[PDB]
Design a protein around this ligand. Sequence first.
Ligand SMILES: COc1ccc(-c2cc(=O)c3ccc(O)cc3o2)cc1
Ligand SMILES: [Zn+2]
Lengths: 161, 47
Amino acid sequence: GTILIDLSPDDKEFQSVEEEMQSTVREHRDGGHAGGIFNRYNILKIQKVCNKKLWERYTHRRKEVSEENHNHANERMLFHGSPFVNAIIHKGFDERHAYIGGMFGAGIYFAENSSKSNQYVYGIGGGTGCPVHKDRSCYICHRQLLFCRVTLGKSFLQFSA
Amino acid sequence: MAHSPPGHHSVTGRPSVNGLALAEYVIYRGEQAYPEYLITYQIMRPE
Ligand SMILES: COc1ccc(-c2cc(=O)c3ccc(O)cc3o2)cc1
Ligand SMILES: [Zn+2]
């Protein structure tokens, strides 16, 4: 059901998404252990993900949550890095994409910092790095992140250490 | 997969020590997200 439409680097949509990726890179307290050492990315491709079944599931649930929260979905665009990105774009998010050991509970995690999600692209803590070189700071191999439309509803605020 | 805190739809994890860390979020249903863009990229080695 999923089709992927390449965006042109001249297209404003591509540019806004790249800007969201580039501008939300920060330094990490692990000094790059998990996600590598970089201040920016080389963006190779941005594709729009189109799946009617999955979109309608999302909006059905978005409306549900809107109604339970003063008509406010509290919808955001957020990043997600996973070794399971191929499965997510074809079948959707579900329980197998959950971070069972996560510090805010066993759920599906997203980040405003692109560089935070980059730490998960090869697995938790970066696993063993890229599959061709076993290098968590590989500069050669091609990585993929999702920039996702997310319904937060009423969101329990947990301050973290 | 756990449940949302009762009466809530999600958790906002807000770093309180790193002033430059942005927020991170958890959802407890896959239907609360749509994987809209797929970005293919390299990290770049600093000059
Ligand atoms: C399938 O196991 C996974 C997949 C993705 C992630 C993941 C992916 C993320 O993008 C992510 C961002 C911020 C954060 O605090 C946690 C995060 O976790 C974790 C475990
Ligand atoms: Zn590599």
